[PDB]
Amino acid sequence: ATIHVDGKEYEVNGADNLLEACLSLGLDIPYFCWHPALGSVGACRQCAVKQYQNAEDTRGRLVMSCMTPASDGTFISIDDEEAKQFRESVVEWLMTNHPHDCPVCEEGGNCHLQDMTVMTGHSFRRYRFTKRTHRNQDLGPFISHEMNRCIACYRCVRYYKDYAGGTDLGVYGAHDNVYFGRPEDGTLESEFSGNLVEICPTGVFTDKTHSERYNRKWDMQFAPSICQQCSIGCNISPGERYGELRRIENRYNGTVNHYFLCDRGRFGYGYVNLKDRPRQPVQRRGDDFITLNAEQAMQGAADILRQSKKVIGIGSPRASVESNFALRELVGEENFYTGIAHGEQERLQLALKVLREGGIYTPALREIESYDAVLVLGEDVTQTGARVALAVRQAVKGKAREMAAAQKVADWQIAAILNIGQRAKHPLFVTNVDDTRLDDIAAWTYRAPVEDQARLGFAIAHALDNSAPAVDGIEPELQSKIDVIVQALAGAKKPLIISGTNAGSLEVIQAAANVAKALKGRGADVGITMIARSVNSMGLGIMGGGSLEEALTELETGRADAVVVLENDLHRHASATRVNAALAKAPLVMVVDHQRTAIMENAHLVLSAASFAESDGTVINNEGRAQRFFQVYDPAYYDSKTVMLESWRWLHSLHSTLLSREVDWTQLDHVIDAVVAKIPELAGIKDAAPDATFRIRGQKLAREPHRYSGRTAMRANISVHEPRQPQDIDTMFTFSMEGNNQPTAHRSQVPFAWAPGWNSPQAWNKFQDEVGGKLRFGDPGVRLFETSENGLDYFTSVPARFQPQDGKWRIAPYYHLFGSDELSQRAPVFQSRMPQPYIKLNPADAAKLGVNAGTRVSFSYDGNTVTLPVEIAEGLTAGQVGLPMGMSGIAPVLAGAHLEDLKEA
Amino acid sequence: EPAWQTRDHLDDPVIGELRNRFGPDAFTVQATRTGVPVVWIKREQLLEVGDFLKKLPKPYVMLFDLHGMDERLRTHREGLPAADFSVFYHLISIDRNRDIMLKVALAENDLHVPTFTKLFPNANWYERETWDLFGITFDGHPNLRRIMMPQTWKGHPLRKDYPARATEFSPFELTKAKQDLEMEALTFKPEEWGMKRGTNEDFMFLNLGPNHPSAHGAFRIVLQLDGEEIVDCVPDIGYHHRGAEKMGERQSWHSYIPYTDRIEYLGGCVNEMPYVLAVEKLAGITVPDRVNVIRVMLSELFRINSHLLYISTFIQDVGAMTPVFFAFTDRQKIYDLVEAITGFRMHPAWFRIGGVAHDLPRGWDRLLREFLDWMPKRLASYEKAALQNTILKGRSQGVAAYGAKEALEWGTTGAGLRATGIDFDVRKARPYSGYENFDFEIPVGGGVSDCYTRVMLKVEELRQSLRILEQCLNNMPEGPFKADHPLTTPPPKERTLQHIETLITHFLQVSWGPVMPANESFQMIEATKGINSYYLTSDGSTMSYRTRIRTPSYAHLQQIPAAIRGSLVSDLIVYLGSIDFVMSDVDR
Amino acid sequence: DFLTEAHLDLPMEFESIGKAGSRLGTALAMAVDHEINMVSLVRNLEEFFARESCGWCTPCRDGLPWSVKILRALERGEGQPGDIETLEQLCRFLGPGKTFCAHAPGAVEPLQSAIKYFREEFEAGIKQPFSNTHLINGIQPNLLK
Ligand code: SF4
Ligand code: SF4
Ligand code: SF4
Ligand code: SF4
């Protein structure tokens, strides 16, 4: 299309509206109610431009640029006097009731309303009357509510209800008393309620965890990191002040997690700021815990390891690729053990084999929203991979999108699209042991044990393709539901099958692979998504190694007299008694970790490793994309006694001190080169980010904004002399404002978004090639593998149906977004949000055992009797007891295990 | 049309003459807010264009400025030739009362321009400073050494990839630099400094510095001497370099004003005025009349302060140490008024974008009236005590004299240029800050610029500044002390304290900075010691993309060797006392 | 829009009333006598229109209460200079196409017609001088002229 803005000709996309087209050209139009991910509604009336009928026209007409298509031969003006006057008047009308609150408001310096008040040029107040006032509500531990600052732009309700599918936030009231919030005081129930603090252009919804230790945006030190709380790998901007991690903001990635995070990633960072974290290397001598610096710790550990006869290393999916590879190099390839159990490793390797050898294209997180039918097998996506559940909701609304596009309704006219596609939606079929949070939009839900869900998947694959193995013993009603699912999936242009390792069953993954292969054999555009558990579970699966049971066997048998545990608590993947006995039998335990774990009481040496905020590295997310995360701040800048290094740096220095009796720490690119040279499967991690010599016209990339303050006073209480600026030899970023953060800089890693006049998260519009699209020079992250030329064979291992045996109870896994991830429960703001530790019982089984709801029952697992209160679960099948995975005392390895002597105490 | 409007200046006759001589495709005319025609010339035609401008019927006789710009990070370069670096040449034609800014675009690898010294001798130090700070090589330069940084300095500081902030201190670097300070007298080679035939063996080398017993600053001059006669001399400057331009690239438009104070630290508000005027040109702000008269008042007060200190130091350098005490009491009276108005003595930091920080305090006219009654008797007393003395006249008359041609070719401005008989003051030729509404005279000399002629011209300038202060006291408009613009930084304080839109504007202006749209602006004013100028390039951000401060003391120090050649060391001392320079102005 | 006695000899068609500066509407005319103050009548109209706003879009929702407060100030003689100009700017900027629906153009039609035909009643309410700011001790105000 051809448009003419202020007499200047531009080529745009005709399917776009004028606001996003002009913002993609770099032109500045103020806007409040429009969002790139939410569409246009024409509410705030801020984006007014003046449209002319043709080339010669002097009158014009004030039109709404978000509601006006950028058709061919359009003529508009932004800097027209009437348009500028009306935009200033709209800002003035919004500012009539706005409270005098900017000094004590957490959106100050980050406020879109502040930016657009300044940008319209409105600074003189002629309104002399009163301002309307609203009482506030308690929205939970994460979101702070202040309704006085609202401009009634309707972004919160649109996102939370239409986009995120939430049901507890709405708009109430009338003419100028419109209230945006919950119908009563209570926690916001949605798993994506944290994105309200970026969706809201004002300070109505604010990050309360950030508000506890608040600092302004210009005072932050930012880095581009990867969220470490599940396997999705959402791009984040951690921001730091005064030596503590202060906030997690959403960093735009047009391929993964474009504008939105989930609440676990946005509020689960608080384990970084814990005061019990190790800050120095500590050696246990008898009962004393003496403190070493880095060199003496390296020398002593190297000496003791040199006297040992066999040193084994236990990695973890918490640690990055470089840390796991450095441990593997230190202990040897045959002595390296992955930190997960045998069953977890088997499921992880099967999911990896399906992903990179099944011949079916695994989509990115943004690409999930374009699939025409979704089948989720076994995985509770909202509690394990929540952003995938959000993308599934968008893919479900794709049917209404298609129905409106068939009537020549523009794709940004979201209200007309929702009116046309009233309740018609793409088919979603979810299977779980109980109800899921996707059930409000799912076409069907199957509450059944994991064997029965696997049998349902195998039956779907057999009904789609007769060469697939069949399932005998299907009820006629279940067969009717099976053929409903099959007719929905076969008629879909782009079917998507989502499974994962969290179901605790190999057969569920096999059934999902069979369904994907059967859909591929019919010529469909099938995609498959596998949800892993931890941040680098795919990386540890690709690198591979022995299971934790083999490492414990080597420690118990005495064949290994030294164990190096890297970033692992060892209790989520094995029984605590066995781990404690094996570690007590080992004459040397050496734990390299950044969180105070329970296995350090018997550890002979403890290395204070760095968390993701204080380390650089690479992680592989669930889709097989390698992504680099960068250090946010130097932990030794404020406390000079703090010796906290990267895990790969620690282990490479230990290997050097063991071999040549000398200390060499590393550079990060050296470890990256070692990984891509010795492991050809991980050879794609080199292109995840450029090396430390990458420059933008000769200068590095700035971590903090150019108006970063307090440089000569923030450390003045320790010493009046300003210290050396910290040197970052590992990466291309500098720990200072002396760098480049231009929107037009030829780079992909953006630590934070800021443009002059755009201080809010709307500066990402300046950082993109087109608004709502990708980054200008591509998104960071490179897929490790392409899709295979040939697929796998059908999995013939069809399990039998679940038989409830007497005296035993099958443990059904229950996952929580707040509580199941290991590092997130350590965050003290999560204890107000994590549910009470329950045990889920079927009503028939609870009546058989004579237990009501809330009474305490005691069960013994691995000879350890623990007691939990009973919650009645209607959807849980009998013979199963439901346990909350990843909580205190309940390892996630317990999924699918049998429970004995479950009896009321 | 407002004075800050973007003009291409295609109606300038210099553009038509250049089009007729070199052709319509030989150059690119740039539309700026500098007020002068900006013409992008090809590098191979630079000397031809300079010669053509030098041989005009009303020629461009003075190279006002010459420096460089790092254009690699400049996003908004619409209508500009592709340039990694650029070199700009600001030339002034006094006969036309016009000026032109030629610009030469250089690629990153081919960073060399032909030297401009065969047309203008001030291009020696200007090109030395351009090479020192940008790494741009000038072919044909007689000696292209570093002038601001020491010779053993790595990198070029005004480049965009150079870190602005201070590096960590090492006593090892200081100790070795003490070693070169020790062997500098022994291992001195005149070929390094451009001198020839050093040590004939009838010449000796004299070093005055580094610390002089005077208030003009610390610097060195190496002299080639035959007995007591100076044959060759070059000044060693850069001992007062503070990185003010590099600081201008890392401070916001509002937070840079205290740094503009300390350029010429005897000037204060006189130094603040061209910066805030150029920022207001970028912002499109027309200040009200009361702002103009307030700024004129403070500039004239600080001009009288600087002139009094200069006359006192010249008298003390002659040998009479008495009148400096009384004139510092007069400076204390001026400082009393300045403390009352701005809250500070020497660096007020009181001018703002769009106005001034506060309104005038209640009772300013009383202090001004007492000062204006106090001044003339003290001025006549100083005149009769020292400036009519025959010993001072014998020490000052005929010492380091130059004519109009030497002042024009060396960029000398202020008292010396007017002492050469050329009537050129910026307050009359190119008026600013409402100086057309004041009745005052411009003193000029007979045609030869001695020490005595310059000192008497400064005394007459003090008298005219007293006249301007009387007009400021008698006629002051009642109205706003800040503009009615949204870009007035900061907004008026009471509206900030009780209105929320004003609070928003104040919040975003004092924290992130005011957003100046992408343009180039230039303000040239008459400072206390000559002609000062601020050249500001904005890329659309809240900080300056390029701050270029032209100061006259640079040109005066470069004219020092051309005027004292063939004189004595005492003549050099009297000349140094009669220039009215500060080393912060030279080195900035 | 309000019409005077000169428009009483006009046929009740859409085109005729539209060409006179008003609308035929529902064609149920309402007569205003000399006892009714025009400022109070327009205040009643604008109070209805402001309280029956749906709240979707900014000009009606946040500008009809401004006109309501201005007319309330004019009713008791507490109007200040700039009030009638603010009302006229509100009438111009709440026209068709500037708001999400046609409720606010119908809201501002009687206000602009009464300002056009009965301006001497609106000017009678402006008695007090304009004062949006109070004095703050220690800060000299910026006395704009
Ligand atoms: S929401 Fe924005 S305008 Fe309102 S008080 Fe907060 S920072 Fe100020
Ligand atoms: S609460 Fe925030 S997002 Fe919701 S309408 Fe108000 S300003 Fe918009
Ligand atoms: S979906 Fe996973 S990776 Fe993304 S923000 Fe949530 S916990 Fe982090
Ligand atoms: S003009 Fe219509 S859409 Fe806008 S707030 Fe008023 S009644 Fe609602």
Ligand code: FES
């Ligand atoms: S952005 Fe278009 S009306 Fe709100």
Ligand SMILES: [Ca+2]
């Ligand atoms: Ca590092």
